[PDB]
Scaffold this active site. Structure first.
Site, PDB file in Angstrom:
ATOM      1  N   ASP A 172       4.244   7.626  -0.128  1.00  0.00           N
ATOM      2  CA  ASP A 172       4.327   6.380  -0.905  1.00  0.00           C
ATOM      3  C   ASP A 172       4.056   6.698  -2.402  1.00  0.00           C
ATOM      4  O   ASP A 172       4.700   6.135  -3.291  1.00  0.00           O
ATOM      5  CB  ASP A 172       3.251   5.434  -0.436  1.00  0.00           C
ATOM      6  CG  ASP A 172       3.296   4.071  -1.211  1.00  0.00           C
ATOM      7  OD1 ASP A 172       4.371   3.436  -1.188  1.00  0.00           O
ATOM      8  OD2 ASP A 172       2.344   3.765  -1.927  1.00  0.00           O
ATOM      9  N   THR A 173       3.120   7.613  -2.674  1.00  0.00           N
ATOM     10  CA  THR A 173       2.830   8.042  -4.068  1.00  0.00           C
ATOM     11  C   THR A 173       3.982   8.752  -4.714  1.00  0.00           C
ATOM     12  O   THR A 173       4.320   8.478  -5.899  1.00  0.00           O
ATOM     13  CB  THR A 173       1.535   8.908  -4.094  1.00  0.00           C
ATOM     14  OG1 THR A 173       0.484   8.089  -3.548  1.00  0.00           O
ATOM     15  CG2 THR A 173       1.169   9.297  -5.575  1.00  0.00           C
ATOM     16  N   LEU A 204      -7.844  -1.175  -3.853  1.00  0.00           N
ATOM     17  CA  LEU A 204      -8.474  -2.538  -3.839  1.00  0.00           C
ATOM     18  C   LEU A 204      -7.864  -3.449  -2.744  1.00  0.00           C
ATOM     19  O   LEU A 204      -8.547  -4.320  -2.230  1.00  0.00           O
ATOM     20  CB  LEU A 204      -8.338  -3.198  -5.280  1.00  0.00           C
ATOM     21  CG  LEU A 204      -9.171  -2.403  -6.321  1.00  0.00           C
ATOM     22  CD1 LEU A 204      -8.978  -3.104  -7.663  1.00  0.00           C
ATOM     23  CD2 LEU A 204     -10.700  -2.310  -5.911  1.00  0.00           C
ATOM     24  N   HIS A 205      -6.590  -3.177  -2.361  1.00  0.00           N
ATOM     25  CA  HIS A 205      -5.968  -4.003  -1.309  1.00  0.00           C
ATOM     26  C   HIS A 205      -6.606  -3.714   0.067  1.00  0.00           C
ATOM     27  O   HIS A 205      -6.349  -4.440   1.010  1.00  0.00           O
ATOM     28  CB  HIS A 205      -4.427  -3.830  -1.292  1.00  0.00           C
ATOM     29  CG  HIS A 205      -3.977  -2.541  -0.658  1.00  0.00           C
ATOM     30  ND1 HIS A 205      -2.751  -2.422   0.000  1.00  0.00           N
ATOM     31  CD2 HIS A 205      -4.567  -1.323  -0.615  1.00  0.00           C
ATOM     32  CE1 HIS A 205      -2.595  -1.170   0.424  1.00  0.00           C
ATOM     33  NE2 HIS A 205      -3.693  -0.477   0.074  1.00  0.00           N
ATOM     34  N   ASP A 206      -7.439  -2.683   0.152  1.00  0.00           N
ATOM     35  CA  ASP A 206      -8.152  -2.356   1.419  1.00  0.00           C
ATOM     36  C   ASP A 206      -9.414  -3.153   1.588  1.00  0.00           C
ATOM     37  O   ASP A 206     -10.049  -3.115   2.687  1.00  0.00           O
ATOM     38  CB  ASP A 206      -8.567  -0.866   1.445  1.00  0.00           C
ATOM     39  CG  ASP A 206      -7.374   0.096   1.534  1.00  0.00           C
ATOM     40  OD1 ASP A 206      -6.321  -0.302   2.067  1.00  0.00           O
ATOM     41  OD2 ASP A 206      -7.556   1.268   1.150  1.00  0.00           O
TER      42      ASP A 206
END
Ligand SMILES: Nc1ncnc2c1ncn2[C@@H]1O[C@H](CSCC[C@H](N)C(=O)O)[C@@H](O)[C@H]1O
Ligand SMILES: C[n+]1cc2c3c(ccc2c2ccc4cc5c(cc4c21)OCO5)OCO3
Ligand SMILES: [K+]
Ligand SMILES: [K+]
Ligand code: NA
Length: 352
Positions: free
Chosen positions: A171-172, A257-259
């Site tokens: 994804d990166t 932060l979405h975790d």
């Protein structure tokens, strides 16, 4: 009385339901096409191939050619592959979206496909009803399905740890070009950067190559740093970001932060704010911004990742208004969003 149907029901609307029912077939046919390496056999061959020709190059022998034909028929219908009659023979080629199945460039998606469609990693989705009707349990669906929270699970399952890390590395890779070319001025003036939760280092190896002046550090949990290569010029440090964020010119957090829930994000963001200098320090957040009002190409997958976070990490994907409240609550002066034509956007958060 009830509705009484007196004429033919709509076929298209019933087919819509069937297609959603069998959504998983697209996922798992695509998994098999990846495992068989069909797109790369054809792409390397350089022209469409017959069934027999394809068979000779498959990853193992023998090959059930009837099965291969029927899977190819389904992949043709997805419009990933093509089929045509050429000089008296049926030959299979690639359609334009199959380019993402082709190895050797930054937008190859194969690692992410093998991670996301893994059987164990799909299991938490079977517990979605349990995420709403909790019976008082506060565990994530991931813990209900696989026994413990996701991070400790990766600590205890080296093969899964590696699969997860490589899906995130992929994804990166998908965003790094746009990040280092379109957002280059974000790295101006910076002499040090720490990628907090930086995974196995894809992001920092790319930033370090593009900005040879910046001393880069990857920071993650011990079991992830243990799955990473060692480079002399990039610092690799392990630890817990809830207890320690290293002082640096810039902190970056991609898909971190979405975790986490709001309170946890505010705590993380405050610690990042305290780690960077009042003179030019910045925190670079890379995560989805969910649109509230308009449809975009990545809208459907961003809502999907919202539920994925709900089930797997306990987090969420956030709207701009939600990002604003979090960054405000962490005490920053303001923020600036940069779209990079990707799933995620860039949010620079500026301290006083
Ligand atoms: N307490 C903690 N401290 C540091 N890293 C943590 C952590 N809890 C989870 N992580 C790391 O957070 C990362 C979330 S996945 C995102 C990885 C990488 N930034 C990328 O976008 O590709 C994982 O690598 C996970 O190991
Ligand atoms: C959405 N997910 C869920 C996962 C997951 C796992 C393990 C790995 C993943 C994962 C790994 C790489 C990913 C990469 C991605 C992505 C999503 C994922 C992704 O979307 C954008 O690129 O345990 C059950 O849930
Ligand atoms: K399944
Ligand atoms: K959206
Ligand atoms: Na029907």
């Amino acid at each position: 009385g009830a509705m009484v149907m007196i004429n033919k029901e709509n076929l298209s609307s019933q087919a819509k339901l069937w297609n959603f029912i069998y959504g998983f077939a697209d996922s798992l046919v695509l998994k098999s096409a990846v495992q068989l390496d069909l797109a790369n056999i054809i792409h390397n061959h350089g022209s469409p191939m017959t069934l027999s020709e394809l068979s000779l190059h498959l990853p193992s022998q023998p090959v059930n050619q009837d099965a291969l034909y029927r899977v190819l028929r389904y992949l043709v219908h997805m419009k990933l592959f093509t089929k045509s009659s050429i000089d008296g023979e049926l030959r299979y080629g690639l359609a334009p979206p199959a380019k993402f199945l082709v190895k050797g460039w930054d937008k190859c998606m194969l690692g992410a496909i093998l991670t996301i469609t893994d059987k164990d990693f799909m299991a938490p989705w079977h517990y979605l009803k349990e995420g709403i009707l909790n019976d008082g349990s506060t565990s994530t669906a991931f813990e209900k399905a696989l026994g413990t929270n996701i991070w400790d699970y990766m600590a205890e399952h080296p093969e899964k740890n590696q699969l997860f890390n490589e899906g995130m590395a992929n994804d990166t890779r998908l965003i790094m070009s746009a990040l280092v070319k379109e957002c280059s001025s974000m790295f101006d003036g910076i002499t040090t950067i720490v990628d907090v939760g930086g995974g196995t280092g894809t992001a920092v190896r790319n930033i370090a190559k593009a900005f040879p002046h910046i001393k880069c550090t990857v920071y993650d949990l011990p079991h992830v740093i243990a799955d990473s290569p060692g480079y002399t010029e990039i610092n690799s440090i392990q630890g817990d970001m809830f207890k320690y964020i290293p002082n640096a010119d810039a902190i970056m957090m991609k898909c971190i932060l979405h975790d986490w829930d709001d309170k946890e994000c505010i705590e993380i963001l405050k610690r990042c704010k305290d780690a960077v200098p009042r003179d030019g320090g910045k925190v670079i957040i890379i995560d989805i911004i969910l649109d509230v009002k308009s449809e975009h190409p990545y809208t459907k997958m961003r809502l999907t990742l919202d539920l994925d976070m709900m089930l797997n990490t306990g987090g969420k994907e956030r709207t701009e208004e939600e990002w604003k409240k979090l960054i405000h609550d962490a005490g920053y002066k303001g923020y600036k969003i940069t779209h990079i034509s990707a799933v995620q956007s860039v949010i620079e958060a500026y301290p006083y």
